Amino acid sequence: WRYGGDPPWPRVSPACAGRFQSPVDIRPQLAAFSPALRPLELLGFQLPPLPELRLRNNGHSVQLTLPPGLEMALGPGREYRALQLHLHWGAAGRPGSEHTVEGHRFPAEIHVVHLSTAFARVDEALGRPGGLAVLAAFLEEGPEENSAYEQLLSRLEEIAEEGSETQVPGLDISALLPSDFSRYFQYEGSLTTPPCAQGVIWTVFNQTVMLSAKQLHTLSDTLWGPGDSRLQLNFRATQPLNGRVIEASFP
Numbered sequence: 734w735r736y737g738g739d740p741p742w743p744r745v746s747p748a749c750a751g752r753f754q755s756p757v758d759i760r761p762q763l764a765a766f767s768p769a770l771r772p773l774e775l776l777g778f779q780l781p782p783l784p785e786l787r788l789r790n791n792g793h794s795v796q797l798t799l800p801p802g803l804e805m806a807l808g809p810g811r812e813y814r815a816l817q818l819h820l821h822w823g824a825a826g827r828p829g830s831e832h833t834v835e836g837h838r839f840p841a842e843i844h845v846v847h848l849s850t851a852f853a854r855v856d857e858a859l860g861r862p863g864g865l866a867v868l869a870a871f872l873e874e875g876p877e878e879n880s881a882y883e884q885l886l887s888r889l890e891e892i893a894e895e896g897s898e899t900q901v902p903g904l905d906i907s908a909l910l911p912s913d914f915s916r917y918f919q920y921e922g923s924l925t926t927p928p929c930a931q932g933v934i935w936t937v938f939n940q941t942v943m944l945s946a947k948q949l950h951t952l953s954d955t956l957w958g959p960g961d962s963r964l965q966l967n968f969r970a971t972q973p974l975n976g977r978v979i980e981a982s983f984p
């Protein structure tokens with residue numbers, strides 16, 4: 734499968750034609766305030782430098798493989814383990830976040846993908862309710878170089894070619910996320926690429942993460958994808974809520 738052309742995704746996976754897909758346009762007036770949504774909790778995200786982690790240009794994103802022992806809870810009894818994180822982005826003067834807010838597309842987006850502790854493997858969790866959970870944050874332009882992001886972004890030249898990878902020292906993985914874990918939207922949807930399985934719990938932070946202009950340019954102008962093409966605009970069009978109500982942890 735690829736962005737911007739064939740094969741049609743429903744042909745690759747029928748779940749890509751499900752009614753309840755991601756990403757979506759968050760319209761926060763239509764979000765439902767839900768006070769049972771408590772602050773997200775993360776354990777083990779502050780990693781030592783060794784052992785190193787694998788960072789891969791997979792042709793459709795840059796993906797960092799996370800080690801065992803990263804625990805995430807969406808709430809009491811809602812427990813997950815982190816598997817990997819990756820990015821979606823646009824191109825020169827074109828934003829490429831997956832989620833939008835009142836139609837606004839942000840420069841880029843981070844996803845940290847998690848497996849429910851009830852499942853040993855992703856393929857057993859696929860399509861099961863709450864089997865997979867993704868934390869999502871928008872990346873915007875700020876004045877300073879983001880030091881946590883610089884650790885990944887400084888290595889993209891090494892993985893410019895589709896299918897290449899490199900090793901990077903462990904870092905504080907939670908430093909790639911906003912510090913505000915209290916304010917977020919949450920809805921049930923799908924993986925945003927094939928196999929587009931449903932049952933995925935999406936949590937989208939209110940607060941954004943700040944990268945420098947240079948960093949955002951590095952992300953969008955360094956990697957190459959399928960064929961002789963730049964890896965850019967690697968986001969799926971927003972999908973209709975189709976009756977789903979997005980919850981918000983705030984009024």
Ligand SMILES: NS(=O)(=O)c1ccc(-c2cn(-c3cccc4ccccc34)nn2)s1
Nearest residue numbers: 844846855856859867923924925926927928
């Ligand atoms: N953009 S996204 O976060 O929604 C996303 C899209 C696809 C993802 C994905 C695929 N994964 C898989 C990993 C390992 C084995 C798998 C086996 C079957 C299907 C997906 C698998 N895990 N996340 S995460």
Ligand SMILES: [Zn+2]
Nearest residue numbers: 819821844925
């Ligand atoms: Zn993603």
